[PDB]
Design a protein around this ligand. Structure first.
Ligand SMILES: [Ca+2]
Length: 161
């Protein structure tokens, strides 16, 4: 497995996950990310109903179990950890995601509103196919579009330098 997290219920029962969970029946209370980077959301489907405005938390690898801030209803790995960038439809990493290991000339996820850049330097464009003005962004956490240097819902292509 390339990403892995352990989750524990208030009653003491544990389960490990290695892939995205759009829904989860079990109520988990404590967490330890053992591989990769994960995002947890208060609502199912990665905070889609709230357009990213419900509670969320991004967690990195850890050596110990600790409390979650809320009971997750969905959670997923950031699959471009150590590879590239992931784009998200909603602020705060919510909604439909799109992984960019490399340049993408035509981004179409219903309007990009946040991003996690793990690796690379990139130029971000508000037209397809690297047309028009661009902004440069490297590794970082970008919880809204303004942080990326683009208008909300406007990112259309992203070139890796
Ligand atoms: Ca959006």
């Amino acid at each position: 497995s390339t990403a892995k997290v352990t989750l524990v219920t208030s009653g003491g029962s544990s389960q490990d996950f290695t892939s995205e969970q759009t829904n989860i029946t079990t109520d988990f209370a404590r967490v330890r990310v053992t591989k990769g980077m994960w995002i947890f959301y208060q609502q199912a489907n990665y905070n889609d109903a709230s357009g990213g405005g419900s509670l969320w938390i991004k967690l990195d690898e850890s050596s110990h179990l600790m409390d979650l801030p809320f009971t997750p209803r969905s959670f997923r790995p950031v699959k471009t950890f150590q590879v590239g960038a992931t784009l998200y439809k909603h602020v705060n990493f919510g909604g439909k995601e799109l992984d960019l290991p490399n340049s993408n000339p035509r981004i179409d996820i219903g309007g990009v509103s946040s991003a996690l850049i793990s690796q690379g330097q990139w130029r971000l464009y508000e037209q397809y196919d690297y047309a028009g003005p661009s902004t440069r962004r490297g590794p970082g956490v970008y919880v809204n579009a303004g942080a990326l240097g683009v208008a909300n819902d406007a990112l259309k292509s992203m070139e890796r330098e």
